[PDB]
């Protein structure tokens, strides 16, 4: 019955100072202990400071410097705080729970773009047969979440209630946008009678696209 | 504090095969080590603790094993999805990871469709036409974006995915997007494949107002 | 990489002697120059006195014979203290770096109601719809904090991982009290699963409230 | 000391538009003046020095051009982030700023919600309404607080929120208030709006014991 989330800015311009919230359930932070740990976009994970359940905190000599963790009980949350970023301090951010030396559950996972612009919505277009596939089984649907940062997406087929034959593959980057391109396979029974649908979200764009995907005529 | 060293960056074996992975640290870790497992956007999973202690869901392929430096990960019966980076963790001394080790299967074979813009997509100015191209085994490929006849070669840009839990293929979007323009100076549109898994390509098409 | 942080009172009683604190980083204070520039409530931008590389201080006249600039290296702090404030002094003060002539880096940001009152921490109540809005994708929420002061609370809705659509609308003057009102806008599909709250915090009043916003019922 | 003047105090234009800005000494500046732009809330930034160079990271559409006491700053091609208030300081004689320039620009449109006093709010014998408008053009609103029929005109304050470092819109909070007494002493709570978007007016409304 443990937790773990975890609560940030999406963007923070260099210079500044990141500050996330770990936000525990199921236990009690006065009987554990929660740390910070990062995978650095292109990195390995790395521990960055520990946060007793006696108050102490431990920090990453090498991130000590800069990062400064601490909590806040009768709310229950651990908290961060880094000042003073580079670019190689982007990707995704998570904080744990911690038992005889290591971290038994927690982890629900947190991202984390760092450079100096701003946002920008996700553009949602279908993706459907120009007539072509009709009688097999057995249709491959899609759609492309275009032109978004700083970073991700996150399409769900309908409703999450297909699940197999989903296919969103990652995405590239633009003139300094993101975009991706999901898919979906489905037998062709459900793609008529019974609808299918994307379903797009970009938290850091409050974002919250639905796009139903039709088939074409012409 | 202990720096941590996972020996083959890169393992690929077989369903069934059993594979043996490494760790050593710097300094005597006495018996303080940690299986991480990450599986590519997801919270690193706990897979064994202190050397070698099954963490309370990890089925029993997992198995830990070591003394002071150096230490191992076995997975006696490579499943399918068992594909992901592994780190060791290491808290004797002071609570540091590991390079970590990929671990791709081995398998074989493709799978492709297109699509073209949406009323939409077009409707402002621009036209972005993607060939897909799932499941396909020897990860590598290679496609190439016609046009009546062209062949445009770019202006697309496409990704893969990662190693499937279940069904050890890889996956490949790419698109090829134009102004709207010229997308809407042809009727023709097309992108051949190619693999290995045939010799005579593969390519899907796709003519203007139709569909 | 050059910062420029300042600390100081919040408050000051009138008569008192006010005195901040520039903390310089990136640089060094014997290679540069420092100097305090304040914005007077209701007023434009005016030069205090400027500290040397080489320990000179120079005065603006007028400010001279109640404001005395100085400096520690050791520490990397230029400080302010100015006997004898009227509540015309009132407003951010901000330390700078100085070239040729001007500044080109530094300026974090540092207010200061200077009044013969005191402080009174912030009352934070919750802004939601008397049933009303419903299915629309976009639901607008709030947190109304009142009665504090001095100047300024600083509210982040859901940690700061909203932004988009968040809009703290400035204060207003009460009974010698100050109370503002932030909202946010969200896609209804995140009011309901997953849950939108403020925060709140009124730094001379070591102040952290917040205010999550449930749905009224009624 | 030198006195600067801003003489526009507050100019607006729209995207793309190119302007120009002012600041002039009572005493020959000698060409060393200095343009430091604001932006609610953020520390002033140094576009251009020494009369007219460039800092190192202001964009080009930024210049500088004078002459012992007449200078001046324009930004060709004005953005939609360049809202913000220009202040121009002069350290020829003796350091002193300018009473700034206000800068906004075009675009038009509203939106409005309603919100009576909380739980809270409420049981502290303190009932507070408000009616927010978000994102609207031109700045010009009027607002109406009126209560079955009624219409109580007072006891009542707003604020309006800078122009969009985004949407170069505004926005407006106004929150009426009374006892835990009468606004308990009635059900019926309404808020007319009043644009220019439109002609007929916007008004939400809510009923006591209702939400």
């Known amino acids: 019955q443990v937790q773990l989330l975890e609560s940030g800015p999406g963007l923070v311009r260099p210079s500044e100072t990141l500050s996330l919230t770990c936000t525990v359930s199921g236990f009690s932070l006065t009987s554990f202990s929660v740390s910070w740990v990062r995978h650095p976009s292109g990195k390995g994970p790395e521990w960055?400071?520990?946060?007793?359940?006696?108050?102490?905190?431990?920090?990453?000599s090498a991130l000590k410097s800069r990062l400064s963790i601490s909590r806040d009980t009768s709310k229950n949350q651990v908290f961060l705080k880094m000042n003073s970023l580079q670019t190689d301090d982007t990707g995704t951010?998570?904080?744990?729970?911690?038992?005889?030396?290591?971290?038994?559950?927690?982890?629900?996972?947190?991202?984390?773009?760092?450079?100096g612009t701003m946002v920008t919505v996700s553009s949602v277009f279908p993706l459907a047969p120009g007539s072509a596939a009709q009688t097999n089984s057995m249709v491959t649907l899609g759609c492309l979440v275009k032109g978004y940062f700083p970073e991700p997406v996150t399409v769900t087929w309908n409703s999450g209630a297909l699940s197999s034959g989903v296919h969103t593959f990652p995405a590239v980057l633009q003139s300094g946008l993101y975009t991706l391109t999901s898919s979906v396979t489905v037998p062709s029974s459900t793609w008529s009678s019974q609808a299918v649908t994307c379903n797009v979200a970009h938290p850091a764009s409050s974002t919250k696209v639905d796009k139903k995907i039709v088939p074409r005529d012409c | 504090d202990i720096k941590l060293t996972q020996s083959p960056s890169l393992l690929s074996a077989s369903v069934g095969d059993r594979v043996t992975l490494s760790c050593?640290?710097?300094?005597?870790?006495?018996?303080?080590?940690?299986?991480y497992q990450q599986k590519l956007g997801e919270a690193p999973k706990l897979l064994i603790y202190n050397t070698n202690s099954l963490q309370t869901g990890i089925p029993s392929r997992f198995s830990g094993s070591g003394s002071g430096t150096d230490y191992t990960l076995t997975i006696s019966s490579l499943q399918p999805e068992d594909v992901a980076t592994y780190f060791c963790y290491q808290y004797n001394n002071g609570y540091t990871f590991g390079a970590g080790t990929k671990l791709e299967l081995k398998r074989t074979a493709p799978t492709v469709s297109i699509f073209p813009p949406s009323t939409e997509q077009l409707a402002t100015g621009g036209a972005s036409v993607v060939c897909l191209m799932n499941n396909f085994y020897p990860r590598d490929i290679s496609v190439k974006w016609k046009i009546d006849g062209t062949e445009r070669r770019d202006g697309v840009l496409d990704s893969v995915t990662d190693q499937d839990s279940k069904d050890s293929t890889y996956s490949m979007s790419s698109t090829l997007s134009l102004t709207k323009a010229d997308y809407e100076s042809h009727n023709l549109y097309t992108c051949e494949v190619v693999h290995k898994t045939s010799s005579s390509p593969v390519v899907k098409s796709f003519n203007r107002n139709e569909c | 990489q050059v910062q420029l942080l300042e600390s100081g009172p919040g408050l000051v009683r009138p008569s008192e002697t006010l005195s901040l604190t520039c903390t310089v980083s990136g640089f060094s204070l014997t290679s540069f120059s420092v100097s305090w520039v304040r914005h007077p409530s209701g007023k434009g931008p005016e030069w205090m006195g400027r500290?040397?590389?080489?320990?000179?201080?120079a005065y603006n006249s007028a400010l001279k014979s109640r404001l005395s600039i100085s400096r520690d290296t050791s520490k990397n702090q230029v400080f302010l203290k100015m006997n004898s404030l009227q509540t015309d002094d009132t407003g951010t003060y901000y330390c700078?770096?100085?070239?040729?002539?001007?500044?080109?880096?530094?300026?974090?940001?540092?207010?200061?109601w200077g009044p013969g009152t005191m402080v009174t921490v912030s009352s934070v109540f919750p802004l939601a719809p008397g049933s009303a809005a419903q299915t629309n994708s976009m639901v607008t929420l709030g947190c109304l904090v009142k009665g504090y002061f001095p100047e300024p609370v600083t509210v982040t809705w859901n940690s700061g991982a909203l932004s988009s659509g968040v809009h703290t609308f400035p204060a207003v003057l009460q009974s010698g009290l100050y109370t503002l009102t932030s909202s946010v806008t969200v896609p209804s599909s995140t009011w309901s699963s997953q849950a939108v709250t403020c925060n709140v915090a009124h730094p001379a009043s070591s102040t952290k409230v917040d205010k999550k916003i449930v749905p009224r019922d009624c | 000391d030198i006195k600067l003047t801003q003489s526009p105090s507050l100019l607006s234009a729209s995207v793309g538009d190119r302007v120009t800005l002012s600041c002039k000494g009572s005493?020959?500046?000698?060409?060393?003046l200095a343009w430091y732009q604001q932006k609610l809330g953020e520390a002033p930034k140094l576009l251009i020095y020494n009369t007219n160079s460039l800092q190192t990271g202001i964009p080009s559409r930024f210049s500088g051009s004078g002459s012992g006491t007449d200078y001046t700053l324009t930004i060709s091609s004005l953005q939609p982030e360049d809202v913000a208030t220009y202040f121009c300081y002069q350290y020829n004689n003796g350091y002193t700023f300018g009473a700034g320039t206000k800068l906004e620009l075009k675009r038009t449109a509203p939106t409005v919600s309603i919100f009576p006093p909380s739980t809270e709010q409420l049981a502290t014998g303190g009932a507070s309404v408000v009616c927010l408008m978000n994102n609207f053009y031109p700045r010009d609103i009027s607002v109406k607080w009126k209560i079955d029929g009624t219409e109580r005109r007072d006891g009542v304050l707003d604020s309006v929120t800078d122009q969009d470092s985004k949407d170069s819109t505004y926005s407006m909070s106004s929150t009426l208030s009374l006892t835990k007494a009468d606004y308990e002493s009635h059900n019926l709570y309404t808020c007319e709006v009043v644009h220019k978007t439109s002609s007929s007016p916007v008004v939400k409304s809510f009923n006591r014991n209702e939400c």
């Open positions: 500290m040397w590389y080489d320990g000179y201080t």
């Open positions: 700078t770096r100085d070239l040729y002539g001007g500044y080109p880096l530094g300026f974090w940001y540092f207010d200061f």
């Open positions: 005493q020959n500046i000698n060409n060393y």
